[PDB]
Structure formats: structure tokens, C-alpha cells
From a paper:
Gram-negative bacteria use [name]-dependent transport to take up nutrients from the external environment, employing the Ton complex to import a variety of nutrients that are either scarce or too large to cross the outer membrane unaided. The Ton complex contains an inner-membrane motor (ExbBD) that generates force, as well as nutrient-specific transport proteins on the outer membrane. These two components are coupled by [name], which transmits the force from the inner to the outer membrane. Here, we identify a conserved motif within [name] that we term the D-box, which serves as an attachment point for [name].
The [name] periplasmic domain alone yielded no crystals, even when high concentrations of protein were used (data not shown); however, crystals were readily obtained when the periplasmic domain was mixed with the D-box peptide. Two different crystal forms were obtained, both diffracting to approximately 1.4 Å; in each, the asymmetric unit comprises a 2:1 [name]:D-box complex. Essentially identical structures are seen for the complex in two different crystal forms; in addition, these structures are highly similar to one recently published, which describes a 2:1 complex of the [name] periplasmic domain with a 23-mer [name] peptide that includes the D-box sequence. Each [name] monomer contains a five-stranded sheet, with two helices packed against one face of that sheet; two [name] monomers assemble into a dimer with approximate two-fold symmetry. The two protomers contact one another via the loops connecting strand three and helix 2, imparting a V-shape to the dimer, with a deep groove between the two halves. The D-box peptide binds within this groove and, as hypothesized, assumes an extended conformation, forming a strand that is recruited to the edges of the beta sheets of both [name] monomers. Thus, a single D-box strand is simultaneously recruited to the edges of two different beta sheets, one from each of the [name] protomers. Because the D-box peptide adopts an extended conformation, the side chains of alternating residues point either up (toward solvent) or down (into the interface with [name]). In particular, the side chains of Ile-57, Val-59, and Met-61 all point downward and are captured within hydrophobic cavities formed in the cleft between the two [name] protomers. Met-61 lies at the C-terminal end of the D-box, and the hydrophobic pocket containing its side chain is partially formed by the side chain of Leu-132, offering an explanation for why the L132Q mutant fails to bind the D-box.
Numbering used by the authors:
A (entry chain P): 55 to 64
B (entry chain A): 61 to 135
C (entry chain B): 62 to 134
């Protein structure tokens, strides 16, 4: 049930 | 194979690139763009005021469709 | 024991049951995780918390080296 994400920033 | 950019506007309209989508049409659009390659990264961006309930509805739709590589884009 | 970062509608934030702020969250987190940056951080937020707030938290985590995030609803 968690949704794995990454954070992408310029 | 262009980068996949999914955006949500403040009025909660949604786009893949410039292509309008809703939660009901998004997976059909993604599958055509990615040739079904689920290992594609989905880069997600949203207007500052888009809320967590809306974001999670999008994330759930991607997740259930097997799109498991998701990057949240900040400014 | 998984680390849960919670953000409420009124902007209050918690690591587990303990309140933090944007400027104190990392020192509290590092103390909790023994500085292990491979710990998954589970994130939950009230329905009305906005993307600008989420990204501020995600950026604080990312700058500190916590790359593994799990969003919970």
C-alpha cells in the first residue's frame, strides 16, 4: 500500500 | 521514447505532455506512449495548490496499472 | 520499525508521535535512524495538504540524503 517515489529537482 | 511528464493543474485538469487526460483515460494514454514498458519513469508535477487527496488518486491509478517508477518534480 | 512522517492540515508535522518543524525534522530523523539514509521514510498527509507543502518536506529529506520515500494514503 505505500507508493514508492523519488524526488526530482533541477 | 520521449520523457513522460504527467501534470495536474490547480483546477485539477491533467495532462501527459500536452495531451489532456483524466483518471479514466490516463492509463490508455500512458500505455500507448510507453509501448507498455512499465519500467518507464513517470515524472509528475502539479500546481502548488493541488492537494494530497488529488495526488494520491493519480498515484493509485498509476500504481494499480503497474507503473512503479515515479519521480515527483519540484520547482 | 518504519519511520512515519505525518503532515496535518494545520501544517503541524510529526515523526512518529513526536512533533517537529521543517528546521528540526532532520536532526530528529537522524537521531531516530542512527544516520542510516537507506531507511524508508513513509509520508502521510491530511487530504487538504498541498503539493507546495509536500515538496518542501520532500526537499528537506532529499537534501539530507533520505532518498527512499513511500507515500501512504
Amino acid at each position: 500500500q505505500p507508493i514508492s517515489v523519488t524526488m526530482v529537482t533541477p | 521514447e520521449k520523457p513522460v511528464y504527467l501534470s495536474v493543474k490547480a483546477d485539477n485538469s491533467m495532462f501527459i505532455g500536452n495531451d489532456p487526460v483524466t483518471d479514466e483515460t490516463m492509463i490508455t494514454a500512458l500505455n500507448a506512449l510507453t509501448e507498455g514498458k512499465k519500467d518507464t519513469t513517470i515524472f509528475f508535477r502539479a500546481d502548488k495548490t493541488v492537494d494530497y487527496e488529488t495526488l494520491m488518486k493519480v498515484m493509485d491509478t498509476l500504481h494499480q496499472a503497474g507503473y512503479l517508477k515515479i519521480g515527483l518534480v519540484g520547482e
